[PDB]
Amino acid sequence: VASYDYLVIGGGSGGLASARRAAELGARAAVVESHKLGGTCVNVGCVPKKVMWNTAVHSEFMHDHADYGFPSCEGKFNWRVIKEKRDAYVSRLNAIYQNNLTKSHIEIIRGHAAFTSDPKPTIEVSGKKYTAPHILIATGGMPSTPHESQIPGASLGITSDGFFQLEELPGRSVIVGAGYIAVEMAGILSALGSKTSLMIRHDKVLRSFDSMISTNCTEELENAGVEVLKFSQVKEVKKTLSGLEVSMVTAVPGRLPVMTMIPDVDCLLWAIGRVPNTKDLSLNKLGIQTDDKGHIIVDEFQNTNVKGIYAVGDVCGKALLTPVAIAAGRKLAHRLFEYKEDSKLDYNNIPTVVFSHPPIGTVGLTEDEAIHKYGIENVKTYSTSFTPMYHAVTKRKTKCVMKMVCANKEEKVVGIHMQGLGCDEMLQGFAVAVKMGATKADFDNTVAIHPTSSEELVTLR
Amino acid sequence: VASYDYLVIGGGSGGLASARRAAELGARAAVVESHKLGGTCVNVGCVPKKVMWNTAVHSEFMHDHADYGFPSCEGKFNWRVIKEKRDAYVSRLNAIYQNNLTKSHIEIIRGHAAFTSDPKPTIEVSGKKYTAPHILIATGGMPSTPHESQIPGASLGITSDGFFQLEELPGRSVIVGAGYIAVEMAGILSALGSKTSLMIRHDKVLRSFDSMISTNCTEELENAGVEVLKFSQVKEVKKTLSGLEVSMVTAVPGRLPVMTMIPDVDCLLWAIGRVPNTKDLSLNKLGIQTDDKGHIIVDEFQNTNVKGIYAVGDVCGKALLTPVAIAAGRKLAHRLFEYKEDSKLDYNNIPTVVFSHPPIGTVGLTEDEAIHKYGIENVKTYSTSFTPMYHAVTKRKTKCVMKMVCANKEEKVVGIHMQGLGCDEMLQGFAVAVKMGATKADFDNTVAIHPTSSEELVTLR
Ligand SMILES: Cc1cc2nc3c(=O)[nH]c(=O)nc-3n(C[C@H](O)[C@H](O)[C@H](O)COP(=O)(O)OP(=O)(O)OC[C@H]3O[C@@H](n4cnc5c(N)ncnc54)[C@H](O)[C@@H]3O)c2cc1C
Ligand SMILES: Cc1cc2nc3c(=O)[nH]c(=O)nc-3n(C[C@H](O)[C@H](O)[C@H](O)COP(=O)(O)OP(=O)(O)OC[C@H]3O[C@@H](n4cnc5c(N)ncnc54)[C@H](O)[C@@H]3O)c2cc1C
């Protein structure tokens, strides 16, 4: 039984960040990883997604070329070219991560970990045993897929994982789900030329975002050529002579249900949710608590219910973002190895960017959330809607919407929501301001930067 | 003698902003304007510049098209197309401004104003007299040009004003000056296909910016195809059979001076400075103080040395930006018509964006300024330099540099300097944070947004 100061199960963002900070603090750490280092962010998430986004963004700007005084750009996007370059880049990252571990003197244990029956928390990887007074579970999650029992032929569809394996641009694609990943994939496939439908169970996407965003985002998708199938769901999928045929039920409220066949579908993409990767960990051998989806339950300090066992990142099922897993992993290393007992991640005011077209940036409370927290009488919002100056000369148009949610007399800024060109790079600093507890006067007292879209936020009235 | 509560001389950004806020407060105001409303920002500055920038930005992205999986884009930018669209847009703005004045019940007095000999401060416009207990001078400035006495043939060159009149893309262009306007024009002309030289008196451009920025900016220009002629200056200009011929002296220190002829120049653009527009105001009739460049001297509250006469904006020669003229004009209306005696603009921590390629964003103290203000022992900087993920797949590359200047033990953030893709939209919110007196811990305690360039600022170590 090899003993370490810190054993980290999962070599993704949370696991790596935590292991690296712990090593800086003197800890003797090892990381167990059964697949590729970098985990979701590098391999099938953040990185490859952003590259595909930058590519879709090229496609849209090329629509405006002639408007800008250039000669029309003629054609066919070549999927394999960018795919090959994207894979390469991912390979460059994997090698860098490996090198980061080595320079930090972190041991990499390759294989699939599982807890043992052993009294003192001990894991087994490939027949060998490992132990530590502090063990971090950071095994992330996976895409959720429907059961053949509920939706026959569901297994003919792919997930976001499968999207990163595609070698050609699917001719006809149907995306099922209304969350960010659904929205992002539909946007990329559509911009790149796939005839795309997005199938959602209600009337809008991103229903958990501020209502100005879910509304605007649904509209922008339609404006961009994405067919949004509202109140629809898949009843069954079948392999036809040439593609898939999707049977769906559309049940608009106040209407009779109608069944529709979607034929000649090349790509059926399920973007319905993520499941935690805890199933094969043998958690029960230690009686580690999970919820009924398989998520590991932790406290504010990432503790599980068992002493010396912690969990961070997607496995915990809260705020499923790469920077969150990193920050929580880091704070945990300081608490464990630097004895900072108050060391923990504040889960409020975490900013998010959704890489739609145009991108979405959000931080803090939606209007309804502030209304429930402070009372209608105590919530004041300011918002603007305009066409960015970039489109002053284009036939194609997109809008920019911004909303600021203030609370109490002081008008504390408790939420910022926006969609528009440049919103992906604009959010960070306002997120800093919101974290510091800025009020509307703080924004109003900052001189604007002209001409930009960002200046709208400091001149709201 | 028609009497008003407030008379504003100059219908540009500062003048309009001040008149409009005053009118909201009940004041009976009139604006005197001798040319087009909107002044510099609308007509020959901010707006038309940004449109040309967006156009140059198209040109650069089109270089990356093939890298991104698309077929090569072939050609010739057509200047007149964009020029015509740009002029139109400017016409749309002028009509909007006019409408804004009318809806506010502000009277527009068309013509050229000048002070009278009259005891109580009185102006004359087209033979009629006007007076008010509060008169605002907001006449802006103009491009500076060399005297034929010092540089013979200087009048064969144009200024930024003339740039907005060009109808064709000049084949060969030489820009003289090292400030932002010089930098911006060289960048647009070069991106659009003009064979461009930038002639500077020293070794770097933007010498008043943080040294990381002047260095990086000079390099990016060279990398983009701009020829930077260092330690050079124009000795004379002459009209040859086909274009202009520019005689310049190059005097590198530690070297002998060398004289060079630049032939076949289509466009010679002077971007050497701005002069205040005060010359024809008859200031001396009231004994209003000016400096030796013709700038109106004011105090912290925009007062001149004469009671009931104020000045804001470019005419004052400090922080020559559209948002500054607006903010100072607005603060002044609140002080005069809302009786807020402490109402004034804080000239510290004003953010600036330079629309180069890539754009530059800056706020607060440069490293040298903080060193002089707090002492070397009390200044700590953090900086990063990386290649944005956008170029992971391109042959063409640009860099992103960021520098944070902290002061004292607390590490108060006293300056932020950056150059890079997305930096134009990224600055605003950090400017809010810096204005509120954030420290490095405030930044460090804000969760990052991944994957973005902006997140680099919250993860500096
Ligand atoms: C398509 C997509 C796009 C996304 N885009 C973004 C984005 O733009 N921005 C953002 O912030 N977030 C984004 N996310 C979410 C973000 O990627 C995740 O929140 C983050 O990667 C979770 O990190 P983690 O460390 O919890 O898990 P992971 O990075 O998944 O790490 C888990 C690791 O543990 C390994 N493992 C699992 N079980 C075991 C075991 N028993 N033994 C050994 N090793 C094991 C797995 O192989 C894996 O490498 C995206 C996600 C997806 C799917
Ligand atoms: C090429 C260029 C690009 C720029 N780009 C930017 C940018 O991107 N961002 C930014 O923030 N700033 C930028 N600036 C600077 C910004 O435009 C100026 O600081 C701002 O316009 C100054 O405003 P003002 O109100 O002082 O003057 P102006 O807008 O110049 O207003 C002065 C007005 O007074 C009128 N006038 C003058 N004398 C009289 C008189 N005697 N009687 C009647 N009317 C009179 C003039 O016609 C004019 O309309 C740029 C400037 C230039 C030249």
Swiss-Prot record, chains A, B:
Residues at the catalytic site: H450
Modified residues (N6-acetyllysine): K36
Cofactor: FAD
Keyword annotations: Acetylation, Cytoplasm, Disease variant, Disulfide bond, FAD, Flavoprotein, Hereditary hemolytic anemia, Mitochondrion, NADP, Oxidoreductase, Redox-active center, Transit peptide
Residues annotated to bind NADP(+): A178, I181, E184, R201, R207, G273, L320, V353
Disulfide partners: C41-C46
A GO CC term assigned to this protein in UniProt: extracellular exosome
PROSITE patterns: PYRIDINE_REDOX_1
Quaternary assembly: Homodimer; disulfide-linked.
Other observations noted: The active site is a redox-active disulfide bond.
Domain remark in the UniProt entry: Each subunit can be divided into 4 domains that are consecutive along the polypeptide chain. Domains 1 and 2 bind FAD and NADPH, respectively. Domain 4 forms the interface.
Record function comment: Catalyzes the reduction of glutathione disulfide (GSSG) to reduced glutathione (GSH). Constitutes the major mechanism to maintain a high GSH:GSSG ratio in the cytosol.
Protein name: Glutathione reductase, mitochondrial
Gene: GSR
